[PDB]
């Protein structure tokens, strides 16, 4: 559900397809709650010390991050209700505020399959298989899509949390754990079935058809114009300089940090997600 942008201008046009952006992140005039509002750390793409971390970052249009509770173990077995869909410009997904009926408001991710007012139940128990029901992978039946994946028991969901993200289940392993999960980016992982996850898919499935259109929209969301490494200077990339078109330097063009970048995998040797794979991008781990 997207719509193209009509320039209607007297100086050039743009080619953009944009979501409605007023049903998700819908506030016409926003009056955010002041007792629940926070101010974030702003370096413009730099380290806390200020040193560069990525090339030419900046352009965030004053984002404010709503607090989110991904563990969802603090209100287990209590029947909440979807109270509101709160604004969240810092992400691609706009999380949902719910309220457990003992008088406890909280936040959860926004999966497709919850409506404002639905009495939901986030508990670590064999409960109804619906979105907004954060529930361990052990009791989740095979062949069902899932998100909010995590790989540390009693830690809270971290993996598969962006807007529209999901996963697939096609079996388990003979370890009392490591349920087979086809996780996005084409990785057949085996994460512990005791891990807590939300069955379904995160909201904003329309985010797969967004088109920028302008440099204004390029710089309104934390991104800045990027330059090909061909048109660099000496001592930056060996690509720049000379007459005609700028060459590509060595047999493997480099990064602005000065290292080769073609076909090389930089996987860590201390992450608990490399050994727990069935099929990797080229190998199995």
């Amino acid at each position: 559900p997207i719509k193209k942008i009509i320039s209607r201008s007297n100086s050039g046009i743009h080619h953009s397809t944009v979501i409605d952006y007023k049903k998700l992140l819908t506030t016409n005039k926003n009056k955010p709650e002041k007792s629940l509002l926070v101010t974030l750390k702003k370096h413009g793409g730099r380290n806390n010390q200020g040193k560069i971390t990525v090339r030419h970052q900046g352009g965030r249009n004053k984002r404010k991050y709503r607090i989110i509770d991904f563990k969802r173990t603090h209100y287990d077995n209590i029947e909440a209700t979807v109270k509101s869909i709160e604004y969240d410009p810092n992400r691609s997904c706009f999380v949902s505020l719910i309220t457990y009926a003992n008088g406890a408001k909280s936040y959860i991710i926004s999966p497709d399959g919850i409506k404002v007012g639905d009495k939901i139940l986030a508990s670590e128990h064999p409960i109804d298989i619906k979105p907004g029901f954060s529930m361990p992978l052990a009791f989740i039946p095979e062949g069902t899509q899932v998100h909010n994946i995590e790989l540390h028991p009693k830690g809270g969901g971290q993996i598969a949390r962006s807007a529209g993200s999901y996963a697939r289940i096609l079996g388990q392993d003979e370890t009392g754990k490591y349920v087979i999960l086809q996780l996005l980016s084409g990785e057949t992982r085996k994460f512990l079935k005791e891990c807590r996850a939300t069955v379904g898919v995160v909201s904003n499935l329309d985010h797969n058809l967004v088109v920028i259109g302008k440099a204004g929209r390029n710089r309104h969301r934390g991104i800045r114009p990027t330059v090909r490494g061909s048109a660099m200077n000496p001592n930056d990339h060996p690509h720049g300089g000379g007459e005609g078109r700028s060459p590509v330097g060595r047999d493997a063009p480099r990064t602005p940090w000065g290292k080769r970048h073609m076909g090389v995998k930089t996987r860590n040797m201390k992450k608990a997600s490399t050994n727990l794979i069935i099929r990797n991008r080229k190998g199995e781990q």
């Binding site: 173990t73 287990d76 077995n77 209590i78 003992n102 508990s123 128990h125 009693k154």
Partner: protein, 145 residues
Amino acid sequence: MKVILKQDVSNLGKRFDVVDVKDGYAIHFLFPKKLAAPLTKKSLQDRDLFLKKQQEHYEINKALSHKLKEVIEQTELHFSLKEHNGRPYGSIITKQIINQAHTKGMALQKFMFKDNVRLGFGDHEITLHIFEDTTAVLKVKVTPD
């Protein structure tokens, strides 16, 4: 290294009265039976004194292990819980059993990690074994409320 072997367990057969095998930093450096002690108390003159000490502690240690087995069969512990909407609410950590053990004026151990979170409740048995000839068994009763 460790020169005190009043009792004995090394994941295989080994005997007290000082009979160990090299492990470096391991069960030999961590079990309560095997703890470091200066070598100033070990010599040819001190060999007999060390043997007498090891014996005395062996007999009194077996006696006290039996006696603790019976007294834990006699003296029990107390627990309670709260419930919310027909299902359990959390998980069990050994932090709180350390709390209840200390509250009476003594302490327990840490390096015996063998347990996972107990999703169930009610009366059951926690079996932690500290010695080799007499087993230590504890009963924990949790009252649903």
